[PDB]
């Protein structure tokens, strides 16, 4: 009985950790390229150099 709750606890912990990190860095990146610059180019190419 103890090993099933320990294993499901650590499995749900690592997946909710990866999900929280994914949503965290997803919001922190999507409020970063919001300067879109139609008439110029990419703002400083270090950002899309990090990305692509």
């Amino acid at each position: 009985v103890y090993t099933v709750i320990v294993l499901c606890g650590v499995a749900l912990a690592i997946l909710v950790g990866t999900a929280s990190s994914a949503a965290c860095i997803a919001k922190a990146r999507r409020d970063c390229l919001t300067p879109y610059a139609l008439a110029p180019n990419a703002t400083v190419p270090t950002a899309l150099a990090v990305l692509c």
């Binding site: 919001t34 300067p35 139609l38 008439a39 180019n41």
Partner: protein
């Protein structure tokens, strides 16, 4: 060049299509006077208080190109004139109120610069809240103190 955002018979804001797609304020809701650019799904950006979303090839050239070239001088505005005060655009007394959101300004050459959010007065003549672009090509807000959303 103009597309309103109204709701149930009162003015709330006026959208524009700049350089290839459109934008719209976030404190302004309801009806917009098209079904082409209403059908698109829009991405909202809370930090600049304007959403963005692409328009199809049907609007390939009816848009208005933009710049960042603001030397000191008088330019034209939809309900009057402006004054370049060191990056702080401003509106004559009493002119401009509720239902004047997203109104663009226009230069002497046919170039758009500023998008509006609200306004606040300091002394003799009322300052306004600007969304503009710089010579480097990144966007700015210059919001006065106590500028409630119109």
């Amino acid at each position: 060049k103009t597309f309103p955002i109204m709701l149930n018979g009162q003015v709330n804001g006026y959208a524009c299509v700049v350089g290839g797609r459109l934008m719209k304020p976030l404190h302004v809701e309801g009806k917009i006077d098209n079904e082409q650019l209403a059908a698109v799904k829009l991405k909202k950006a809370s930090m600049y208080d304007l959403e963005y979303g692409d328009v199809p090839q049907n609007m390939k050239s009816d848009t208005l190109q933009y710049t960042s070239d603001k030397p000191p001088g008088f330019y034209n505005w939809h309900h009057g004139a402006v004054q370049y005060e060191n990056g702080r655009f401003t509106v004559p007394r009493g002119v401009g109120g509720k239902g004047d959101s997203g109104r663009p300004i226009l230069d002497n050459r046919g170039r758009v610069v500023a998008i509006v959010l609200g306004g606040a007065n300091e002394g003799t003549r009322t300052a306004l809240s600007v969304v503009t672009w710089n010579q480097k090509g990144v966007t700015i807000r210059d919001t006065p103190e106590g500028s409630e959303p119109w």
